[PDB]
Symmetry: D2
Subunit: 387 residues, 4 copies
């Protein structure tokens, strides 16, 4: 049961299944993977495609002839399997040159290098068929208050994203950008730390229509926020261009557990919302198989990501379709929430004595919301315990 | 030393010094205060003014003749002392009718009542001279996933704020709105949970120029966020209309400690930023004297709010003016952060071999940022330990 | 399905279903309940019994004749229903006299009053048949560093618990004590903030055998801790005398959601551990029906507590009994974890070349733990998705 | 001013100043340091000594002749400078063999290897003059619930520590053990996650007198706990054998900032407590110079650790010595906190009508604690703002 197929649009970063297991306190526990092997093994599990940072596909420092050969071998693996590349991104965080940032480094020469490195990889992403170009500014931020003037850094961030938008327009590319928030780690505090901050920033760009968000489950949860609520605001804004799916157990280091692990009920409400809203983009997993695992465990963890999405999709659809749930939603006035407050207009509201002078506040206050019965029907559906 | 005067623009809510000490587990520890007594005692400490919820000034349910008398006595106290009223707000959270929200209650009749209650108090706020009208939607949100469709709630929130903007325009009022974020408490999750989310929402209103933020120190810190960074983004956007100052010790219930308490270094960097940016609005305290205190302790805690702001203002100004600090800022390339990345333009950047083909990445990576020396100069200034 | 009966040992505090809905920002949303009505309604849902604070059963300040009548009516309700009283406790936190603590108040006269108030209620608890007497020191702690010398406070805490142990021994009572940790709320920091701190403190009492812990799900989770791990340590120590079951969504104010809500996977692992260990005490719920609810919603939320325990008990038992899970546990070396490291003794270990000189560290490191496959079998069992 | 000397007992791990800057998302930013150079540079800053993991001093895998030469060169550097080695520890976390733990690995052969590796380094630690042997079980724990039976793991942990105590007794060594808690990172949850849990565990060892704690500032703060409160409980128990000093900004990844950074007021209250209690052990720093820094910045950050301790020591001593503070402490009844509750005994307390029957609860409740005035005197002392 719950078998994934390419039509489900599940995708994985090369760096996910390829993670060698180096952590803040430990050496690698697995050998490096050839990208060709990852494309083949993910296709065998029912994935739709893969994503990459520049430096995952082409080792940093490669000659032009070595670059050509790495791309040629990867394209053959895509052609052998039917796998797609819907998204790509730039590594602006591993190399020591990026220790104070890429686009917002205090050193101007590093900012210019970061833009040239990104532009080179936008060309490659378009050649491989990507629709979305992600930016995770993991080095943009500070450990101390004097190190980074945040207004100046936001000016540099806007300048960078405006130049990238000029570039893609000049080349006639159809690709769009997606900014990925994170609140902290590896910097003490990261700029644009949540979905809200990234959405607000985009409204100051010269061409806002070219930019949206790539929210990650565990990143919003590292600020103790409700991930489904933040996704709802992104959808409300028309800005959910891509998503990163994984798990996280509360406020700690970025765990990148397989999807479904961590906050299981939040995963349920997330899938319910994506499916109800008709989100059509990739279901992308940004996860780390724990370093306890061998290669067999890597593929088991990847398979589990897709399995858990499909279980949750079934249970959320059954919840929404149940006539007893539909009655409970009316008892809780979810239908009234979706009606305008005052389609009669401001003057009519001011002249309505039933809205103030003759409003029975005590009778309204006495009416229970019936939310606990609704939520226990949701629990029963998630757990397969309906009686 | 560090004596406040009205020119410092320190203001306090009636509900701050007037808090009777009821908490989630305990009864009141202090008698109610007459607003007239609070105006008098705050003026004697060097405050500039006071703010109010409707129901702090006029007991809920008052007749028109009782309302007139409560306002008359308050206006006499303002006239007796020279105290101002720069901000007012609505209580859309105490009465049981608001148990599922005001503007985003699932019950439509409660949404309409919430708007009429707000409009009545906007008229009073203008009569008393307020420049800013705050909205804290403390009941807007949920404990469970099915109870609140967040896209529908955001539609109702926008409708409410658009009607309020229509109202103030129709009356020719000069007053502006400020939305106050909070991530949780009293709801399990609150809508518009951070500065970023509120800034993004405002860009979808019909008249965005009429709306800004009222960020509170402790509320951003309840999400583990950097409060100075969020203030910098609000300033970058042109949206810092008002601020709430207090203290908070990390991720827990909303403590509302006196300003300076909680995260002392964050308080330093906050004052540094407000003063460097030339923020001109009220320095408003939203705090609770702990319920351990008697009335003498209430006034001691209020005095401490203002004293700590003035100490931090002195130390931040000395830091920025120190020639050794100015040299350290250049050593750390803060001057280069404020210069454009590519004022030469996109084509020049693409044709610059020094930005990619001939960029010496290893020499750039070897250059230390000197941030620890800069931060220890900042510590020495805060603590009065310069040698 | 999943119907509770008295034999399941589910119990509820009077103050749970009786919570009127006053929160840090809002007035009551429900009328007070007569304890007689709560005993009757809980019995009808399949509960085993009820628990009380002194002041829940007898209003504070009652005459001796009023006290007798309140106890008489309650005893009749217990006799009418077959309901038991396995635990009682003291309210040392609501009345303003306890604003700086009961047993660790800085005022000595308040410490002595707190002990007399507790002793009176121990006599009543024994008369009603309680086996456990809980202490939650919610007011013991501080908002500021100078207010409370913690070594002195721990001396006063030990003196109090030693006097209570002397009292119960002198009367020949069989009752035992259980200390309930909480990290914060209503104090900025509470003394004995976790299970570990309470276990360590007990080892310094004169009669340690008389004292154990009453851990609460949401309280350990307010420190971001793993509740099942802390329960395992309490069991290891022989000190799990009682437990409080509820839900919590991470690091925030104390939510007291119904059991099963909050961290669902942690609830699964908790039930697995209680059942595997043969815990025999009450399954007690310390929860708040949200203030959105009317009386029908109160009883629905109470019913849901018991239903979720029974669903999780079924799924955990099926996991442990599955032969495929038993094979996965051996593949992950859980059997080897339970074997002694060196039953051969220290000298044999020192003389064993296979433990150092001839140990093949690279072959051992290459062996995968197979934990992801084991955890996805656990997920499949929880969700009723086994194929 | 604030110049450290060896008599201040400041010590540093080799791995602190020697950290090359590899983080969860980035490569090294600094070359490796020779231990001889670190001993020399730290002595020049006024340090007292250094500490080491086995593998910091002797590269993993070294021949016996290479081991002898590494120790010989290090001993010469100690003799050249007068530097001491008061503490050492084992690296049971970097090598991939320890991916599921050392003492609590599910694989028995790894548990035995972990003990042999520790014993070899205890012999070396004694040869170099160490008084304390630290254990940080950073790999002991789990990412998932089925992977680790915590009762079985605690049995293996006790067996390991009991064997180490047998070993040191058999050799007639005077060295004692100190367990270092951490709540998470690199495991999803770590066993013995706080000071309380470690203190409780020690009471179950065969020879409890041989074991205490090594608490770290940032580790307790990763659980949102009050570090000074936890130190007070360790001191109350007689178990503060050693301490790790650093900074942390709330609930996130382990930052290991220089001491004084992070929560500055908590650092003040910590130093106040260590000095008031007469703690006599090393003032050890476990910190990371941020990877933004070059070698000059490494030594600046190390110097800042010691400077901040000495500033805070001065301010705390001035607070406690101020007659106005001494009067405020009496006004707040800190003197009464230190007096027994009932030195008259249980029967006298029961017969005292002033403790219950004739206790005026309303007069006691009306008495303010005066804690805000006391705390603003503490703020004024910290900031050098006394008027
Ligand atoms: Ca992540
Ligand atoms: Ca607040
Ligand atoms: Ca609770
Ligand atoms: Ca650390
Ligand atoms: Mg991601
Ligand atoms: Mg506020
Ligand atoms: Mg409880
Ligand atoms: Mg340490």
């Amino acid at each position: 049961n719950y078998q994934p197929t390419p039509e489900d649009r599940f995708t994985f970063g090369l760096w996910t299944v390829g993670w060698q297991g180096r952590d803040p306190f430990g050496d690698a526990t697995r050998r490096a993977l050839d990208p060709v092997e990852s494309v083949r093994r993910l296709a065998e599990l029912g994935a739709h495609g893969v994503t990459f940072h520049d430096d995952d596909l082409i080792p940093f420092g490669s000659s032009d002839s070595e670059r050509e050969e790495h791309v040629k071998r990867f394209r053959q693996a895509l052609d052998d399997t039917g796998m797609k590349v819907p998204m790509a991104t730039t590594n602006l965080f591993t190399h020591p040159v990026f220790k104070d940032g890429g686009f917002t480094a205090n050193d101007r020469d590093v900012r210019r290098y970061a833009l040239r490195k990104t532009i080179r990889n936008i060309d490659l992403a378009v050649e491989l068929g990507a629709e979305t170009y992600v930016a995770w500014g993991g080095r943009e931020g500070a450990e101390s208050g004097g190190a980074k003037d945040v207004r100046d850094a936001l000016d540099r961030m806007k300048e960078a994203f405006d130049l990238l938008g000029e570039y893609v327009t000049s080349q006639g590319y159809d690709i769009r950008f997606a900014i990925e928030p994170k609140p902290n780690e590896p910097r003490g505090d990261i700029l644009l730390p949540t979905v809200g901050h990234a959405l607000a920033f985009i409204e100051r760009l010269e061409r806002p229509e070219l930019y949206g968000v790539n929210p990650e489950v565990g990143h919003e949860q590292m600020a103790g926020l409700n991930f489904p609520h933040g996704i709802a605001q992104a959808l409300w804004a028309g800005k959910l261009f891509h998503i990163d799916l994984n798990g996280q157990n509360g406020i700690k280091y970025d765990q990148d557990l397989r999807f479904g692990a961590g906050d299981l009920r939040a995963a349920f409400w997330l899938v319910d919302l994506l499916e109800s809203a008709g989100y059509s983009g990739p279901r992308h997993f940004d996860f780390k198989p724990p370093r306890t695992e061998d290669f067999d465990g890597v593929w088991a963890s990847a398979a589990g990501c897709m399995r858990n999405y499909l279980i949750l999709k079934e249970r959320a659809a059954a919840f929404r379709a149940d006539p007893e749930v539909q009655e409970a939603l009316r008892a809780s006035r979810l239908d009234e929430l979706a009606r305008p407050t005052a389609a009669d207009g401001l003057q009519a509201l001011l002249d309505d004595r039933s809205a103030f002078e003759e409003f029975d506040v005590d009778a309204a206050a006495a009416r229970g919301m019936a939310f606990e019965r609704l939520d226990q029907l949701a629990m029963d559906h998630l757990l397969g315990a309906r009686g």
